[PDB]
Design a binder for this molecule. Structure first.
Ligand SMILES: O=P(O)(O)O[C@H]1[C@H](OP(=O)(O)O)[C@@H](OP(=O)(O)O)[C@H](OP(=O)(O)O)[C@@H](OP(=O)(O)O)[C@H]1OP(=O)(O)O
Lengths: 221, 221
C-alpha cells in the first residue's frame, strides 16, 4: 500500500502480519478452490509489486503451483516487453524511466521507483498490471486443480438435487470460458445432466424455469 | 400456358414434354400419397383447359381414379350451369360469349376461345376454376387411397416424436375432415396416441400447448 506522510508525500506502508498470515492460511488450507481469486484480490488492494512478491513468496507449500505461476508471470512479462520496445535516450528530470517487462514483476525494481510510477500524474499502474498477470496465472492453476470438467458433472441415482446443483456450480465457477458460453452451460447442461428421476420434472417445467423453481420442484426427490 | 408473341398478341404455347413426363412420374410412382396435390398444382401453373385435359389423360390409365375424377368434374359443371343461367340476348361485339359448364372444361371449346377468355381485362379465369375441380377430384382419390385411418396412427415404443408427428400430420392431411375436427384431432388425439414416456411428458406439460413447445420439450425422448 501507499500512504501520505505528514508532509503529504507518498510513503509505502508494509502489509500487516495479520493480512499476510490470513492469505498464507487461505492458500495452504483451501487447496486452490475457486474462491482464492476474490480473496486474493480483496487482500491485495492497491499494493506495490514488492508487496505482491511478498504475498506470493511467503507461501510455504504448494510449490508446483507457485512454479506454474512463475512461468505465467514470466510469459506475460515477456509479451509486455515485446509490445513496448525500449526508447533510447536520457530521462529528463520531469519524468522517469519506462518500466520494462521485468520491472513490473519487481525482480529488477526498487521500492522508490515503484512508488513513483503509480503516484505520478498521469499514473502508470505497475501494481494493477502485475496483479492482472498474477490473477491470469491463478486462473490456470485453479482450473488445473478442479477435479472434473463441467461436461462430466452428473447427478447420481440417489443424490439430492441441491447437492448436485452445488457441485455443478462449483465446477462451473472453476471453469475457464467466456461469459456467453457460461450462460449457455447454465441454461442447458444443468437440465441435461440430471438423473432420470428429476430430468422429467425439469423438462416438464419449461425452458425458462428459474433455478429457484427447479430446486423447489425437485425438493422431494 | 399463355405467352406474348413478337406482335404483342397472346398466343397459346404447348406444355413442354418434360413437364408432362414429370406429371406422369408423379401419378405412376407416388401411389396417390397426399403429396400428389401440391405437385399437380405446381406443374399446372397457369394452364389453359386444353393443357389440363392433356395432363388429365395420364390418370386415364387408372380406371377407378379416372371415374371418380370424371364424376366430380361433371357434378361441379352441373352446379356451375345451375348457378350461372345462360342469358339470351344481344351482346356487345367487343365481348366474347359465355363459357358453358362444358366449355370451361375444354370439351367443346377451341384454343383461341380459352386464350381470349384468360387474356381479358378484367380476366375471367377458366384455368383456375378447372384446376379447382380437378383438385377436388384428386382430394377424393387421395382420401380413398389412404393406407390407415387417423385413429390407428400410434407412436412406437422407441420411435422419435418427430417421425410420429410427421406421420400423424400426413394421415390427417389425407383424411381431410372439417376444420374444427382437425383442430380437435391435433390438440387431443395427438397426445392420446403417443407412447407412454412422451405421453407422460405431454400430459404434464399442460393443455392447449402449441406444437412447437411439445416438440421442443419432447425432443430426445
Ligand atoms: O419445357 P422445356 O423444353 O424442357 O424447357 C426447359 C426450360 O426452359 P424454358 O422454360 O426457358 O423454355 C428450363 O427452364 P427452368 O424453368 O427449369 O429454369 C430450362 O432450364 P434452365 O433453367 O437451366 O434454363 C431448360 O434448358 P436446358 O436445356 O438448358 O436445361 C429447357 O429445356 P430445353 O432447352 O430442352 O427446351
Amino acid at each position: 500500500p501507499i500512504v501520505q506522510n505528514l508532509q503529504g508525500q507518498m510513503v509505502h506502508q508494509a502489509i500487516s502480519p495479520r493480512t499476510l498470515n490470513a492469505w498464507v492460511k487461505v492458500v495452504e488450507e483451501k487447496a486452490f478452490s475457486p474462491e482464492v481469486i476474490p480473496m486474493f484480490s480483496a487482500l491485495s488492494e492497491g499494493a506495490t509489486p514488492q508487496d505482491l512478491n511478498t504475498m506470493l513468496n511467503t507461501v510455504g507449500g504448494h510449490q508446483a503451483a507457485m512454479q506454474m505461476l512463475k512461468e505465467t508471470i514470466n510469459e506475460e512479462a515477456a509479451e509486455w516487453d515485446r509490445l513496448h520496445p525500449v526508447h533510447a535516450g536520457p530521462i529528463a528530470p520531469g519524468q522517469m524511466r519506462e518500466p520494462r517487462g521485468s520491472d513490473i514483476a519487481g525482480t529488477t525494481s526498487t521500492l522508490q521507483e515503484q512508488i513513483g510510477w503509480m503516484t505520478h500524474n498521469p499514473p502508470i499502474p505497475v501494481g494493477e498490471i502485475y496483479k492482472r498477470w498474477i490473477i491470469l496465472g491463478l486462473n490456470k492453476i485453479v482450473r488445473m486443480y478442479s477435479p472434473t470438467s463441467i461436461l462430466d458433472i452428473r447427478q447420481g441415482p440417489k443424490e439430492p438435487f441441491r447437492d448436485y446443483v452445488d457441485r455443478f456450480y462449483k465446477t462451473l465457477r472453476a471453469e475457464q470460458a467466456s461469459q456467453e458460453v457460461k450462460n449457455w452451460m447454465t441454461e442447458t447442461l444443468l437440465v441435461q445432466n440430471a438423473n432420470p428421476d428429476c430430468k422429467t420434472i425439469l423438462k416438464a417445467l419449461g425452458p425458462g424455469a428459474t433455478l429457484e423453481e427447479m430446486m423447489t420442484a425437485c425438493q422431494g426427490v
